[PDB]
Amino acid sequence: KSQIPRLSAINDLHKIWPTVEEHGAAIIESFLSLDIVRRLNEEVDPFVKIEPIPAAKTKDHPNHVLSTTTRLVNVLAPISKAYREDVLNSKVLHRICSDAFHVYGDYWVLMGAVMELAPSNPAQPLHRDMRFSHPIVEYLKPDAPATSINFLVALSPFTAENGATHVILGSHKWQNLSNVSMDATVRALMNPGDALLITDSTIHCGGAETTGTETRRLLTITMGISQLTPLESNLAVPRPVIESLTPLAQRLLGWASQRSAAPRDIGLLTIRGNSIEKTMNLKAEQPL
Amino acid sequence: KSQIPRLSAINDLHKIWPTVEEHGAAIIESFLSLDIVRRLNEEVDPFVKIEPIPAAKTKDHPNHVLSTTTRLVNVLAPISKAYREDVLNSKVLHRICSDAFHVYGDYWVLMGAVMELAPSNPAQPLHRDMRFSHPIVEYLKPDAPATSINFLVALSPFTAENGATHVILGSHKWQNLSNVSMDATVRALMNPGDALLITDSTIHCGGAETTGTETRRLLTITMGISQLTPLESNLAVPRPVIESLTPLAQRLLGWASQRSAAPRDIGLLTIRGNSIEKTMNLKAEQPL
C-alpha cells in the first residue's frame, strides 16, 4: 500500500495544499528549521512538565478524551518567542492556509498546542478532529471544503516504534466509516521540524509508544476559518506581548477583526463598522 | 394566505421555538416590556443619530449591503444599561435559545444592533441572513438544525405602510429559491416590544417605507451557537462595564469560555484546561 506523500517546504510549496486535497495528508519536510524547533522546545519545556493530567480535577474545562499519559499545553504566545514570531508568521503555513481557505475568507489559529506523550503511551482511537468542540462541522455537506486543517509538527523524532501518527489516505472523502481499521493506516515517520498536514476529515490517530523509554513531542497547529470559534483564548495574554507581534500574528490570535470571502463582506468581530485594531489603537511590532 | 403565528411571551413560552421550527417565523407579543423599550430607545438615541451611512468612506469595515437610509449601531453593552442588564438576561430569550441550540451547545450574541430606517427607506431585497459574514452556513446540510436565529424587536410601531418586515412562511425549509417573490410574503405587524423571531434560513426583507414621514426602529438580536464567530466584538468594552454584568451576560459577549454539547466536550476559548473567567479573575455583578 501507498505511503504519505512527502513534499519540500522550499521547492514544492504550491503542491502542498493540492496534495492534501487529493490524499488527505502530506508530510512537509523541514516545515520548521531545527533552530526554531530547538528554541520552541526550550521555551515550552517547563510548561509541559508542570502540566497535570488532561482531566485534572482542578480544571474548569477538563479534557476527558486524551490519555493520562498525554500532556497538552496551549496558549503558546506568552510562553514562546519562537512560536509567536517564527511560526505564527511562517510563510509556508500562510501560503497553505490561504490556498486552503480562500473560498471562506480569513483564517486563524483554532489551537496551537504542544503535546508530549509519556513512554508507553497507548495509541489513540482512530478519529477525526473537531468532534469534541465543534459539533457544527458534522452537519456540513460531505463535499464542503475543509473548514480546518491540522499541522502536526514533530518536535522530536517520529518512529513506528515510538508511536508516530497513523493516517488513512483518502479517508477525508469517506462517508462510510465501516472500513475504519488500523489495517488501513500508514505512518508519518518524521524528523524534528517535519510536519504532517491533515484536514478535519482525515481519519488518523496517535500511535502506540512501544519502546517504554522514548518521549514523543509534537506541536499541533489547528488552523481554521475565522468563522469558527477557537478552542483556546488569547484574551488573557498581556498587551505588551500582543503589541510585540505583527498585525498578521495579532489577527491569528483574535486580536484583530476578520473578513469573510463574500463579495460584499460585512466582517467579523467589528465595532460599529470599524476594526478591533483601529478602535483599541493596538500597536504592532513593539519590541519587549 | 396564512399569517405569522402570534404567541404570548408569558403563556406560550414553550410553544415559541416549536412554532418557529415548523413555520420559520413567529411573533412574540410583548417580548420586551414598554418600560425596557423606553429606556433602550433613550440610551441608543444619540448613537443612531451620529451614525454615518453603512458604507461610510471613514470605516475600516464598511457595510455595502444596507441602504444609505439605514443606520445600524452595534456593540450596545457600553451604550445601554437596559440592553446589558434586561435584554441580555431576558428569561424568554434564553429559554428560546436553549430550546433552539441544545443540539449544538452554548450560544451567544452574534450581533445585537439597533437599526433605524429613515422616511421613504426602500424595501430590502428578499434574503437569508448570515451570507455576508458566514459563508460556512451555506455549506450546512439542508436539514441541519439552525445555527443562528434573529429576534427582530420593534422599538417603534411596525405597520404595512411604514415598512414592517416581510417573511415567507415555510421558506426556512426551501432549497429551491425560484418561487421567491414578494407575492409569497406576509407582514410582521407589531407594537413596540413585540419581536419577530426568524431563523438563518427564513426568507425575509425589510419593507418599503411609504408614508414619507415615519421613522421605523428595531433591535435585531442575532443569537447563534458559540461555535460561530460573532459579527461584532466586545473586546474594547471597559472592564468595569463587563464586571457589572451577570456571568450569563458575560458569556454572551465573549467574556467567558464556552461549551459544546459533545458528551466529552473539550470546550471553546479555554486556557490550558481553564476558563477565561477563572484565569482573568473576572468579577460579576459589580455595580457602577
Ligand SMILES: O=C1N[C@@H](Cc2ccccc2)C(=O)Nc2ccccc21
Ligand atoms: O483533545 C483533542 N482531541 C481530538 C480528537 C481525539 C483525540 C484523542 C482521541 C480521540 C479523538 C480533537 O478533536 N482535537 C484535538 C486537537 C489537538 C489536540 C488535542 C485534541
Ligand SMILES: O=C1N[C@@H](Cc2ccccc2)C(=O)Nc2ccccc21
Ligand atoms: O447587514 C446585514 N445584512 C443582512 C442581509 C441583508 C440585508 C439587507 C439586504 C440584503 C441582505 C445580514 O445577513 N445580516 C444582518 C443582520 C443584522 C443587521 C444587518 C445585517
Ligand SMILES: O=C(O)CCC(=O)C(=O)O
Ligand atoms: O499523537 C499524535 O500523533 C496525533 C494526536 C491527535 O491526533 C490528537 O490528539 O488529535
Ligand SMILES: O=C(O)CCC(=O)C(=O)O
Ligand atoms: O428592516 C427589517 O425589518 C429587517 C432587516 C433585515 O432583515 C436585515 O437587515 O437583515
Ligand code: NI
Ligand atoms: Ni487528532
Ligand code: NI
Ligand atoms: Ni435580514
